[model samples]
Structure formats: C-alpha cells, structure tokens
Target: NNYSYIDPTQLPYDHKWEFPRNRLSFGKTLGAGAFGKVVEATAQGLIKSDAAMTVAVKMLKPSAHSTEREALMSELKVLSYLGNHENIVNLLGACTHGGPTLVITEYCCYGDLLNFLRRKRDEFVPDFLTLEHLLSFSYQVAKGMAFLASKNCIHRDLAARNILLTHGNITKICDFGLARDIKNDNYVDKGNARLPVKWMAPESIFNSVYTFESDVWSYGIFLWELFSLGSSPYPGMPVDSKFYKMIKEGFRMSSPEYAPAEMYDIMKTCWDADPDKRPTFKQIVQDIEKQISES
Candidate 1:
C-alpha cells in the first residue's frame, strides 16, 4: 500500500512491444500536464466504440525528469490498487516503457465538471436539474471516497478539477498523483504538503497531517463548486492571502448566492472548524439521498 517508487525494470510489462495500433486509433489531444499529453484514442475490444467509447492516453514525455517519472509510477501503482468502481475512473492498462509512457483510461466525453459547469453557466439556475445533479454527483463521489477510506488510502488532492462527468451526469473521481496510503497509527500529521490549500481542511492547511476528516473538508469545497456551477470557490481572493485569512479567521469558501439554504447548511457542517466535527461520508451520503428524495 505504500506508494514507493518501483524500478521500471521490475515492472511486469514489456517495453519493446509497440502500442497496440489495431486496438487504439489516436485522435485529438485532450489535455497536457507536466508528465506528458493526453490524447483521445479509439479502441475496439478494450472499449466499445459504438458506446462512443474513448480512452485518454497519457504519454510520458521522453524528456521527463526523475521526479516526473516517480510521479507517473506512483499514479500507476495507485490506479492498479483501486481496481474498477462505477464512481472511480477506470484504468484500462498502461505502457510504462513506451515512447511516452501511455496510461489508458476511459474517456469522459462530457469533460471535467469545471468545464461542464462553465459551458452551462448562463442557462441553468438553482433548481431540480442543478440540485439533483449536485446531489447525485456528490453521492457518487462519496461512494468512491468511502471505498478509498476503507482501503486506508488518502486522496491527498481532491477538487472539482479532479472530477469528471459523463454525458449522463455520472461523476467519477480522477487523478491519484498525490495520494498516499496511511502509514502509521501515530497520525503524525505531516499535513497537506502537495494538496491544493484552498480546498483543504483548516488543520490540513495549517498542519501537514491528512485524515479522512480532512478529505470531508475538501468534499465541502467540491459541494460549493457544484452548487456554484463551477465558479471558483474563493473567487477574486488572492491565492497567497486566502489561506492566511482562512486560518486566521476560520473562514472557508462561502456558498454562492444561488445555493439552496438547506444545501448551504450541509456544506457548512462539512467545513466545520473542528475536523472531528465533520460528518462521515456515510452520513453525507444518507443526507444527500434524503434531500434528493424530498426534493
């Protein structure tokens, strides 16, 4: 469970084999990151094309440094352990020694939640469509988080940018680059080294220790992102100053103008100043289910 870097030589994959050309037809580039670029690929047996299936191929840059390579391997190891879950992004396979270190994943045709919200921003107001979508998506996220927690794995970075939405409004948590397994019972709390501070819990932001409760705090920010239709959680606030203000005043991202009062109250509970006071994912899921049923 420790995400220790593995030697490429020890990896159980053949480096000499060319990427299966017959299986995947490379298409447009989807996105790029420090490690390399992601492209839309068409695959037949591995993924159903008739279902409009596509895979995001992450190719590691040949010029990638040692740090980037370690990060890539860490992600691969984490994805390997996660297996497949409906709410967790699927990892088809990987090519570690290939030209760019391909990481094959089920493509989200509708794109990330942030882009989806930006596109639909002007058209939708807070209502059944928006609220239902938020609740449903939050449920899916919670399901995935609960699973991770059960495995004693911490998704060090959780945010709207890391969530993908399908055409049917299904949400899948993505990006495990910074995730780490629970090491000791001591709860050393070496807090939030690489986590996105704005979405992090107060204790995590101040201390380095991360816990299941801190993940709940990030989920609260995610809820805000969903309700605001992709608006930046702490909009207009200077990035450097925001965390200081949050720590000093015990402030967190405020619910947007359009968020329902009930939903806002739930988010506040998650963002409680005391991490111990945050609701468990089980509680969150139940509350969300109740809200959806009542609405």
Candidate 2:
C-alpha cells in the first residue's frame, strides 16, 4: 500500500514511514477501541539508521480494509504538516508489513486523560490536584489546537478521551480519525460522515460544515470533560431529534462544579450559537494565560 493519497510535494514534512510486520514484537493490549486494539510492541526500524524500540500500535480489530487504510492516510497527512508541536500527538509511522495493518506512535504510559481523571476522581482535591494543574492541562490542549489552527487543520475529534498524558504535566492531543485539512473550507458529506453528536456545534450538525470555529465548540465540550473528570457529555440527552432540538432551543450543559468562573466563561464563548462568535484557539490560549495569571 503506497498510502500516497496525499502528494509529497504539498507536505511540509515527509517520512519513510512504512514498516514490516516481521520487525514488530507484539505485546499485551493497552486499550481496545471501536476501530481496533492499541497494544504494546517493539518495532524495529527497517532503515539502518532508524532505532528499534517499543511503541504503541493501533490496528484494525478484524483486518485492514478501506476504512483502516483511509484512517491511517488521513491521520498521517494531518500530522505530517502540523510541525513538531509539543501538544499534538506525534505520528512515528505506520506498519504495512502484512499483519493487521497498524498506525504506530509513542505510547502514553499513563494512557488517556479521561481514564487518568476517572482513576483519580476520588483524590482530585484542591490541595492534591491544584488550580495550576487544571489550567496547565487546558492550556496544553489549547496550545495544540492553536497550532493546528495555524496549519489550517481541524481535529474533528477533540475530547478528553482523545488526549493522552505522557508525564505528570505533559499532555499530547491524540486521535485524528476525523481530522481534515480545512484551509479552504471543507464540508463533509452528511450521510457519509460519522459525527460525535455530543461534541459538534449547531452548524456542524445541521449544515455539515466543519471549520476552525466548529472545532472550538467541540473543544468547549472537551474542556467540560476535563473538569468533570470524564463524565459523559450531555449525560442523558437523547442522540436523536430531541438533542438537536435542545441545542437549537438554547439548552447548554451546566458548568462543571470545580471549574473556575473564568474557565467556564471561556467554555460559554466556545459554545456560542454562532460559530463566528467563538474565540480562536490563539485567543483561548491567551485566556488560559490570563486565568493562570489571576490565580
């Protein structure tokens, strides 16, 4: 598989990213997802200079199909141009060596932020967790989104579950299954697109339009997830017409109990009915700084 849907001339960076299946030493499953299982593996670099080591592999549960191939290409295409930002998850490469096809990336030892938050829910107190810690995590996410914004990319899936923590303070935004380059305004065909109904903005759900602004709205929901410690967004809302009706009629989720007023204020701005009214990720980062300064 060439995985050459994207032109190399247009990419800001390129990679000899293909790996052989024989080179990988598989390990226990780290996580199970709808697409596949993300398991530990020791990957050997095919190139002489490339180092061989342990990595995480996301491969289709059943087998490689059009969906899996497209997923890998779309994600690699986005990551290839976004530059080496600290917040965005790094794409090490892909495995095309004839096993279950895999997308390899650096594994987060603590796993996703949602699971981490849930595990620490009982111990999340002012003294133990601290306000700075909250603000820092939010800022890191905002920073990553802002970088993607600069590159004219929209991470269609921006949620706590999509964020991974490498160390105590370092968070790497993960998951690009729905990401797209919207430099010229891309509207996904409604019927073909699989949306995260709870995270989408009004225009996104109703019009099939996805832009940087819609991403901001999703990030607002993501922020809510962070403070609420992985609680399901829109807890009991039906995923059908009632949900859309509720949003159109001005129903919004209540602010998380422990989130700061300033933080919650930004969340409101993000969920503004008019996408144009939402703040840019750059502005979001600034507000995060302002929040930190005031504290």
Candidate 3:
C-alpha cells in the first residue's frame, strides 16, 4: 500500500514548457548533492522570444528514486504557479523528453547569496560589502517573499542558501521543493517530512504547521544570515530537546554581528511566539523600504 516512481508518461508539468533536448548544451556543474545536480548550460531559443541565453539546468542523478523525482516535480509545479517575478527566479523551460529530466531556470551570474557573502569577506577588497548593501539585500528578499505570500504560497525552506544573487545584487528566492499552497492559511504536516528546524518557527517545529507567518519567521533567520555574512544560525545550539525547550520558552537568537538595532528589532518581532504578532511580508517590505529610504 505504497507509492513508487513517478510515471514518466504522466509527468506533472505542462507540455508547452517542455524544452527541446538537442538545443540544450551542458556546461560546468553549478551544484551537486544527493538527489541531483545543477549545471550551467546554454539554451537556444529558450527565453527572450527565441534568442540564445545562459540558463541553470537542474537534473536528477540516474541513481535517484521516486522520492527525488517527486521533489523535483514539486519544485517545478510551484515555480510554474508562482509565475515570473523580478525578485524570484524565473522558470525558462524543461527538458523531459530526452535523457534525464531537466528543470531550466534563469542564470543568476552572481550565484547563491551564502557563498557570495563568505567569499567577499575574504576577498582582497574587504570594503566590497557595506551596511547599505546588506540592508538592500534584506529589502529585496522581503519584496520577493511578499510577492510569494500574496500568491498564497509559502516558501517552507527560505534561507540564504536558497537565495540567488543576480546582476545588480538582486536577491531572488530559489529552490521551492518544500513550498506549498495553502487552503485555509496553513499546511499541516503529518510528520516524517524533513525540515530546516533552525529556520522554522515554534509552531512549525512543534505542530508541523507552515503558513505565511512561518515564512516570516524564516525570513527573520534569513535576515540574521545576511547581517552575519552568511554565518550558520544558532552558533553552538544543537537540534535536541534542550534547543527545542529554549525555543519554546521564547528564547531568540541575539542580534547578528553587523545588524543594526533597527534591523535586529525587526527580527525580534518576527520571532514573536504568537504567529499573528509577526509582521506580514508586506509590512516587512514596507519597513525595509523605510529603512533604506531613511539611510
């Protein structure tokens, strides 16, 4: 009484978005992990009304099973539903006809935010990043999350690692494998789903309930990520009963190293025990806008 692999013939995506296999040329590997690999590739006639363009192609390893297949499909479905937004990565096309299935997306030349931050910290030019730049990144992420929230979509795995930095330092939310649409404001899990506990809210960790507010909580952590120059959240706190107890007792991480008082205030509010008390992404966006404008 269980499920197996996804039926190739019964793929979940629209046929119209299926890309021509021969037209795609793979380049260097961008990222690789257990389930699959992402590669920088060139796609002919994919975007910009049939012009050549660089794209990131996501493909599963031959050793991947149904679980991996389902996760990739889920991400594709979520991206298609979310549509195109400046602050969110855009789906270009898919190559499901030949060889391994590929999910093509716009290439963010600057790459993921976490590595970008870490590298700059050790760069010859230590002055490459400043308070305004980090705050601007925070503002961009909030804007993107606001758009996702308005669409009734919750990015269950919001984090610095999932955010991509494009040209002009634009922060676009990427990686939607765990994202889900809501029916009555929250998606309740029945347990067994792997989650990023540190980036999650108390309710999300305890009751497995994910909502827009949960994403807000995650955004707060993402904020900590930005100001800390991509440092790991909760420096020495291991995910155990003690850590859970502390979190349930309303313990929150302190202000990040470079976070100003105002920025940390926003993060503190976002960590409120009551979900309703947390600021909506729209409100957060407004706050960030004000922060940027006043600076």
Candidate 4:
C-alpha cells in the first residue's frame, strides 16, 4: 500500500540542521502560497550563544499534495547539500519529524535588502553607507553567488528583493523557491512559471534558457539596484513589446551615481549580448576583491 504522508526517514537533510518541532514557536505569517507559507518564529537552542534566535520557518499547509511536499523537501535537500557559507542564509533547523514539515533558516534582521537600501539611502549619509560600503556589499553578493555557481546550482530568480540582510549588514541570498540543481550546462524553462522579466538575460527572455551566464546578467541588474539605492530596474519602462525589442537590440541601464568607473564597466560586461562573453561569478568576485584590496 502507498503511504499517505512523507516519512521523515524518506527525506534527506543535515541532522545538524534538524530540530524538534517543540523547539519552534510560530508567529505571524511572512508570506504564503498554494502549497505552504513562511512565518516568523523563534527557535530555542538553535544558537549556542543565544538560546533563542529569530528564524524564518517554512511549512506546508495541511492540505498540501504530495507534489507540493516533494517541492519543499527538495528545497531542504538542496540547502543541506549547499552546505555553509557566510553570504548564503544559514539553515538553522527543521521540524521534519512529523506532518506539516518545516524548514527553518536564519531570519534577516534588516528584512529585504531592497527596503534596507531605499530606507537608509539618505539617512545613512557619508558616515554610515559610503561608496566603499556599497562596494563591499556588492562584493559579498558576488562571492556568495560564486559559491552558488561552484555548486552547480541555478537561482532562477536573482534580485534585490530575494536578498536579505542579517546582523551587521551581512547580505545573504534567500528564497530558494525557484532554485534548481543544474543537470547540465543549462536548464530550459517550459514557460510553466512566471519569471523576473526585467532581470532576465536576453536569451532567457527570448528562449527561456538559463545558465550561469544568465545569472551573471541578472547579477548586473542587482548591482544596479544596489548602487541606485533600491530603484527598480528599467525604471518607467513597462515590460511590453517595445521593451522586448529594445532588449533584443542591446539596451541596458546606465551606471548609478554610486557606481565608480570600474563598477560600471563590470555591469556593462555582465550585459554583454553574447551569453558566453559574460563574466563568471568567480571572475567578478576576484575583480571586486582586487579593487577592495587596492582601495
């Protein structure tokens, strides 16, 4: 007879990141979808220094189908396999021992990076957020992304909103809802899911082809968001036929005031019409490191 529920043993995850369900105390819902929802919660004993730590808990709804359960399980598996990285959100623990399995991760103190940039742009001034600080944040992202790419993973959606800031302005990539493990050089979307139109590479927009190179294209857009203090990409331009035409013809946003010549040029290379010509995350990380060392 077939099983009615997902067995805890069937699901593979790092035991170190697994916790007792009783250890978690749920709070308000952060977001929700058809399959499940993520909520703000406190996990007791997740951190050694702090007995209780604020964490984001993602759990499936009671009525979730097996397919939806598999999706969430796969995300947990991927996170476990990705291992630990300072720039990537740390997986705190999971309550997968029973029904309504939950995946817990470190909650960002500053919430979304987009809001953080927008709110503090003027208030932070020269003392708080200088060009050097912004550059450092971007470097952090570049380093994290390089780690992701090294693991042969593809973040289908990469943007400022998807990035979170933990303590001390430490940027961590979150929201693996659209992340996938690359089986080959690239993956093709069959148009089943809606994608980030503006942040996508031209090939991705036209053909639904996603590769590390495509992520590089998206990273360039993220850089624009970072330097521009959370201004939306392709400002004032709707994603219409004209936008598609311009994109095909190689239209790209100019550098923000905070972007130095080096940074601007890096963005330009990321937007190279040829996907193969785009710089790998490794290269971008090295480039940023060199600049940081010099200045």
- Which candidate number has the best TM-score? 4
Give the per-residue lDDT digits (tens) of candidate 3, residues 1-295.
3855333224467877798898988999999976578899999888665788899998889988877776777778777777899998888888776467799998999989989889976542214787778888998899999999887788888999999988888889987666777734569877465678999999988888889998999999999998889899999999999999999998888997788888999999899999999999999988888887784
Residue 97 CA error for candidate 1 (Å)? 5.3
* Segments in model 4 whose C-alpha atoms lie over 4 Å from true places: 1-11, 14-16, 33-35, 48-50, 61-63, 124-127, 183-185
Q: Return whichever of 2 and 3 wins on TM-score.
A: 3
Note the residue pairs that clash in candidate 2: none
Question: Which stretches of candidate 1 lie above 4 Å from their native place?
Answer: 1-22, 47-53, 97-99, 127-129, 183-195
> Pairing residues by index, what is the TM-score of model 3?
0.88
Q: What local distance difference test score does each model get?
A: 0.73, 0.80, 0.84, 0.84
Give the poorly placed runs of model 3, Cα more than 4 Å off.
1-12, 48-51, 66-71, 122-127, 191-194
Consecutive 10-residue window with the lowest summed lDDT within model 3:
3-12
Candidate 1's displacement at residue 64, Å, is: 1.5
Candidate 1 residue lDDT tens string, 1-295: 7676443224544333223545667899988876477899876556444543477877777788877776776677666665678887778866654345667787888888888877887777552256567667778898888888776677867888889887677888887766666644313454224447678776765666688888888888888888888888777776686557755596666667677777787789888887778898878877777777885
Any idea what lDDT model 4 has? 0.84
Worst 10 residues of 2 by lDDT: 4-13
Ranking of models by TM-score: 4, 3, 2, 1
Task: Choose 1 or 3, whichever is better by TM-score.
Answer: 3
Pairs that collide in candidate 3 are none
Order candidates by lDDT, high to low: 3, 4, 2, 1
Quote each prediction's TM-score: 0.82, 0.86, 0.88, 0.90
Candidate 4 lDDT over residue span 1-295, tens digit each: 5645333224556677678888789998877876478899988877763588788998888888887887787888888777789998867777777667799988887788888888888865543767777888899999989999988887878899988887777899988866777843478887466668999999988888889999999999999998999999999999999999999998899888778888888999999999888899999999998888986
Tell me the deviation in Å of residue 284 in model 1: 1.0
